[PDB]
Design a protein around this ligand. Structure first.
Ligand SMILES: Nc1ncnc2c1ncn2[C@@H]1O[C@H](COP(=O)(O)OP(=O)(O)OP(=O)(O)O)[C@@H](O)[C@H]1O
Ligand SMILES: Nc1ncnc2c1ncn2[C@@H]1O[C@H](COP(=O)(O)OP(=O)(O)OP(=O)(O)O)[C@@H](O)[C@H]1O
Ligand SMILES: Nc1ncnc2c1ncn2[C@@H]1O[C@H](COP(=O)(O)OP(=O)(O)OP(=O)(O)O)[C@@H](O)[C@H]1O
Ligand SMILES: O=c1ccn([C@@H]2O[C@H](COP(=O)(O)OP(=O)(O)OP(=O)(O)O)[C@@H](O)[C@H]2O)c(=O)[nH]1
Ligand SMILES: O=c1ccn([C@@H]2O[C@H](COP(=O)(O)OP(=O)(O)OP(=O)(O)O)[C@@H](O)[C@H]2O)c(=O)[nH]1
Ligand SMILES: O=c1ccn([C@@H]2O[C@H](COP(=O)(O)OP(=O)(O)OP(=O)(O)O)[C@@H](O)[C@H]2O)c(=O)[nH]1
Lengths: 559, 559, 559
């Protein structure tokens, strides 16, 4: 099978996944079945126990994933839905190997990093490329492999040697190599240097891998004097240096590689079956490049998270939002509001950060309350829903807001201020939200609810049901532990806030809507992990429709 | 002797010399005698045969230097004038060693890179620190050593091993180590990475040198989360991480190190004699920081060079100009004008680049024609002086303009269009500018005129004589081969353009002034290499005085 | 042209030249024209100023060589005589490059180690392979390139990068790579390790060269478990691991590579024109393997040198001696005798080292006095010739003995004890040996006599003339400064010791013979540098013939 191994340049946050997916999604437009394998040097297995401020938010797979992210980017760009066993971490390999030397399966031979780890790496990447990953039941023909991390450090040492042996066991027509480096320029002056790319190549070539292409991502487009120096010093012909500058939206990244002629390259390098057309599909990639230049009324949410500045804790939501903004031809203005900045305590001690949050939340044409944990933010977010409740600005609750909207509603309408979730204080006189993890055969003890779960819409008066297409059940994914008590439904069996969804059996509800409001939805499932640039997320699409008021206008068409 | 060895971070053009001079010129304000030794890994000996577009302009020393530059920066910041034997290049060492193994002075032993080169390096740096360099006849006490180049490449291999052996032969109280790295951030996003600094340390520590300080120069000032990661990963305490952002003028660079408390550091590290005052001299460094923020009428030259965009071919002039702009409280607006863009040929084929040059030269309140060679630019620059001649905008000719102004004047006034310099065409019917290199005892053949040369002012009616202080002779330096024929003076023994200067004997003139003009000077010597931020260059100071019209107002004071 | 680049393993003294010549001299038996280029990382140019105890004796070429040695080994094994410009040292390159940047031939561009040195290396190796080197006037087809030194150190850094760029500029069919490593075993125990070969490969592959073959030279022949580990860890198939153990004579080294089938390898790798016969010439390499096992009367010299233990100061003579011992079917017993151990002074202070020298010199069936310099040994060697003079044991004087034999003869027969050479004391009342270097046009001052020089035999009664084949002139090479005065011949115009040779003009004599003696020869030329395993050196061949007494028996055949 043809394999493409991208790597890393000087710094980690270049845009590794934006290149590996782009050369993947060009080849998906070529008519090739694609997989993706992300090699990760971080020891930690099963990323789900991260605080999301170090790396980013989780992604969630079908079979129970808690996989990093970058993995999410591949899923969103390629139409692929994945499995959890191609997030191949260093802790995944060692737990696969330390659990074999107690079995004795290496026949008493002492196992060392070479070859008995690097044999287990080049068996892992053979099997995950072999399994189909898309709607067809058929093995693919390429496999874009992302060696994450940087290169030269101690973490990346068992892996580049694992692929050095792999160039020999594979054929040279079956292997490729991309190197995505940085040419940093100092705005302080004006020249543009090529030295960081030279030392990053001789750390790659010094470990026994040679770049086919070399991709120099920087701030500005680079001059032909720079393409000459990288061609002469890094010992590759000038047809393999591909510039990519900092573009405004990531949809320019696939069509910018079309101009630099990488499509016909892998015809000659990899010897893959291709004939040439318009080198991507003209209707669905060059179109939405022009949608992002020519824009309109800057509108359509404020966001209440619980973090400081856009570390990608919420980058997996912002790519889902501008999917919907791609549909309604609006520029989107994502503005973070810290839930600390809505507390009583900040106004007492600092009004510069507090009054700064309200200013944006009162002018907000839409709120969004995504998921979170812990006591931070929760007491601040309790006022944000009720502000949206009375003054009727639409919002969506995701995995925490659905908990918090049912808390505030009994406090306001039913005057039951004593009620709260059992997340925080177990001494609950009215335990309105109870813990109940899935007690399944094959799952011992308390196991977090995870994976694809069917949930059926009960009754017709849902604005969500018309958005998915009036199908009875939807198929979504979530990672949360807590539910409103089905006994505690008795408290709200008459109001305007009634529960809509039910799963296969019916022991939880997962979905709320409110009558006397434009658009009041709160869901337990994360509706971000199926959002694609072609069809947006159906809760998020209506949420921007409610912000522009065209939500009734979308259902005038129907039909 | 206490030695400070700065190095290099990721890319070459960080600001190595701006840090090594700054920690030098803090210690000069401490009351310590300073030298400077710049280690250069480039094989080429005696930089003077450079095209000035690869590296920059030359510097010229007293004894006959053709030394790079960075060396010039030390000279200008420290009051030091240097010798040519501390520009210690790789070609200087090998020519010092290959000329010893024919002598047999290694006693028949085969010489290899270690130790017999690295012995010759640590004897070179011992001797150049030992020689006095300033007005006192006394050995200094520190020696700021600049290991130029970057680190990790093949050129820098004989030198870091040369200083690894040097930490043992010296005492730990006598040695220091600075590392000036880059933390590149991508404006494309917003985070700030620390990885390039980590790999640059483990290439330095992997060659056997440990940083005392670590200096992270970048675009923006960096947050305490970045100072924590560099302290924890690069294994130095957080008192040795010093931030320096891209500041507007280089005079902030000494006073910004004062805020980060590096003055008291070397009291504890190097054990040098110091008591504390205001940590620099309050009148002459923090004052001119405020001169550059608060500014005035944006005026005071256009420049006609012969190059494209400000590669530092003329950075050794621009630092001399804003010395004078530091004196007259004016912002300076250096605008390059290519001499190609004044030719007849560009207007025929492209008026976008041609008309763009004139636009700036007609609004120019002052022209400047610095030195150059070859047929490029010369035919273009012939119109620039005559444009300044008739319409009377002041300019200065430096080492080529003095040739070109005497050419145009016989063509215009004396109608001798046949005359030209013997630089370009030897078939000269009127050879107005003749070749005559110095034929000296000890100098065989044609040797370029070079070094400090006395030149005496003949007569009183010079506007230059009042600027230097009415001394009879001035002491300047130049590197040029050509002179107007002393026989050809007969052509101009009556006009308004008469020759002013004479050297010790009188076989050349070196200096012109024109009567019916505000300020018309052309000099063979380079008046850039003595310009300091305290007293500017005396031709360049009057040139900005003529631009603002206060040139008469400067001599109203006198006295 | 097909190029083979051998390298180095862990330690320097493996046997680099014994492998590179052997794969050369197999291909010479294949019917291919061969050159040789030895890359040397030692800075010193023109090895001739060595003390011969660091590296070894010199070799002397035709055009004036003072080249190391290993070069001598190629000459002796291949029938090739060389030029001095393929001893390409590091000091040869830099003196070729520092003498070009004063010319300006790099067009003002700053030259660095990459590429402008490595361009000059891959132009040097192109030209020396291009020039013919053998009796034909035709370019060869292979070029065995010896990258001397080891690999990984600082000296070998400009060269392995110089050949990494060379694999791309050449074609993969035109390039090869040998790696000659050590597998050290400890007699202390018994196992045999493969670790030093693994780390030596990943320092070679880490610099961008891959071994075609891998040659493991050690003490014992190695087991198939060792060939499996080197095949699996060093990532080459088990057909390219070639064992070679410590063999008794170096003539087994070509025929041992025949058994391991490297002849058919380069047919497949290099794509060179070959058909197969007996894979070497059966009459002249496998024959003299059996000559060295089956041997005879252990006889046939003691040697008086001036050194301690057989550092190869005299290895260029011992290979010439066992050429003659290959002809007379005798085992040779080379025993060193220090000339210190024949002095008066050692017997006074130590008789353990003194009496140990005489014991071997009185039982000596032949003496040999090779070349040397300085006051050490000279006063000791004066008794060794007179011991050979009276008691009539044959010897040969080489470049110093010819001086010393003419000194002792006037002291003994003519009773002129006052006479001595002008090498040591210039106050000579009878200056019997005078200095006269060649004063040639194109050679300024005192230049050492060097290169091929014709010398004609005057008269018939020479035992040397019958050995060369009664040709009038012979063609030999030497490096010496001193001659007997042609005026001082008047002292010996009647004795039994008369001068035999004369060059083209006749101002020196170069050759002595004595009548009343079996074999008394002393020559100024070095007769070691033409000795080949087929025909021995004609003075050295008769010297072993005089030791066995068959010297008359050789001339009974004639004819
Ligand atoms: N072409 C681009 N131009 C500007 N910004 C980009 C581009 N590609 C990606 N980015 C932004 O930079 C960040 C880094 O990109 P990406 O997540 O693909 O790298 P990654 O290798 O997956 O990260 P990690 O190494 O943490 O897994 C992303 O959050 C994205 O928003
Ligand atoms: N603190 C600073 N902020 C912004 N720009 C700077 C600073 N210091 C220096 N520069 C600019 O960047 C350039 C590089 O500085 P400098 O010449 O000191 O480096 P260098 O090591 O001497 O260069 P080279 O390695 O070529 O000798 C200079 O031309 C200068 O104008
Ligand atoms: N196959 C062999 N077995 C045993 N000894 C050998 C063998 N080949 C060479 N030697 C001996 O070991 C010494 C080293 O061999 P050789 O001179 O070929 O190495 P070299 O690389 O030329 O040395 P240098 O690196 O100093 O030039 C020689 O003096 C020779 O006598
Ligand atoms: O996609 C990736 C790739 C790599 N990594 C992991 O990040 C590490 C490299 O991390 P960085 O290079 O980003 O540096 P750092 O985390 O130490 O500090 P910052 O610069 O982020 O402020 C690697 O050790 C790798 O395990 C990720 O977390 N995500
Ligand atoms: O002050 C210095 C320092 C170093 N150098 C020399 O510059 C080389 C490093 O040069 P660079 O790191 O700047 O890269 P480059 O010249 O190959 O191409 P650009 O990035 O400039 O476009 C080093 O090999 C060193 O010899 C200088 O010229 N001046
Ligand atoms: O054939 C050669 C090869 C290499 N060399 C030169 O020898 C050096 C390697 O020398 P060694 O590896 O032999 O170590 P050393 O000389 O320092 O000390 P000993 O082990 O000999 O006792 C290299 O730096 C190279 O320049 C030779 O002299 N002759």
């Amino acid at each position: 099978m043809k394999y493409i191994l991208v790597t890393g340049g000087v710094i980690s946050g270049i845009g590794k996944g934006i290149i590996a997916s782009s050369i993947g999604t060009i080849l998906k437009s070529c008519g090739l079945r694609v997989t993706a394998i992300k090699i990760d040097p971080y020891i930690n297995i099963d990323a789900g126990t991260f605080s999301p401020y170090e790396h980013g938010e989780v992604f969630v797979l079908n079979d129970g994933g808690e996989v990093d992210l970058d993995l999410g980017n591949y899923e969103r760009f390629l139409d692929i839905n994945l499995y959890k066993d191609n997030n191949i971490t260093t802790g995944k390999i060692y737990q696969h190997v330390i659990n074999k030397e107690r079995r004795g399966d290496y026949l008493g031979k002492t196992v060392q990093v070479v070859p008995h780890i690097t044999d287990a790496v080049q068996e892992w990447v053979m099997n995950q490329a072999k399994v189909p990953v898309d709607g067809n039941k058929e093995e693919p023909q390429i496999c874009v492999i992302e060696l994450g991390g940087t290169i030269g450090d101690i973490e990346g040492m068992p892996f580049v040697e694992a692929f050095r042996q792999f160039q020999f066991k594979a054929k040279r027509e079956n292997f490729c190599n991309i190197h995505v480096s940085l040419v940093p320029q100092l705005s302080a002056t004006g020249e543009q240097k090529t030295k960081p790319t030279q030392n990053s190549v001789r750390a790659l070539r010094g470990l026994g891998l040679s770049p086919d292409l070399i991709v120099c991502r920087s701030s500005t487009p680079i001059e032909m004097a720079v393409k000459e120096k990288i061609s002469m010093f890094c010992h590759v012909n000038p047809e393999q240096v591909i510039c990519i500058h900092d573009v405004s939206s990531t949809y320019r990244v696939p069509v910018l590689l079309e101009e630099q002629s990488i499509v016909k390259y892998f015809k000659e390098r990899l010897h893959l079956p291709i004939g040439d057309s318009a080198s991507n599909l003209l209707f669905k990639w060059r179109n939405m490049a022009d949608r992002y230049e020519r824009l309109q009324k800057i509108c359509s949410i404020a966001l209440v998270g619980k973090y400081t500045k856009l570390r990608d804790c919420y980058a997996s939501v912002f790519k889902a939002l501008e999917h919907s903004a791609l549909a309604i031809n609006h520029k989107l203005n994502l503005m973070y509001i810290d839930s600390i900045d809505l507390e009583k305590i900040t106004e007492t001690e600092d009004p510069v950060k507090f009054h700064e949050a309200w200013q944006k939340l009162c002018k907000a044409d839409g709120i969004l309350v995504p998921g979170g944990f812990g006591i931070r933010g929760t007491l601040g977010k309790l006022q944000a829903i009720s502000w949206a409740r009375t003054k009727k600005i639409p919002f969506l609750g995701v995995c925490l807001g659905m908990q918090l909207a049912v808390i505030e509603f009994a406090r306001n309408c039913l005057n039951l201020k004593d009620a709260d979730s059992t997340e925080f204080r177990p001494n609950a006189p009215v335990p309105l939200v109870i813990d109940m993890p899935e007690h399944n055969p094959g799952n011992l003890g308390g196991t977090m609810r995870l994976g694809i779960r069917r949930t059926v819409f009960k009754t017709e008066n849902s604005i969500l049901r018309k958005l998915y297409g009036d199908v009875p059940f939807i198929e979504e994914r979530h990672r949360h532990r807590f539910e409103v008590n089905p006994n505690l439904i008795k408290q709200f069996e008459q109001n305007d806030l009634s529960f809509v969804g039910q799963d296969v059996d019916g022991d939880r509800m997962e979905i709320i809507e409110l009558a006397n409001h434009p658009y009041f939805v709160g869901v337990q499932f994360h509706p971000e992990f199926s959002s694609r640039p072609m069809k947006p997320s159906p809760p998020y699409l209506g949420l921007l429709l409610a912000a522009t008021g065209n939500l009734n206008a979308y259902l005038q068409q129907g039909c």
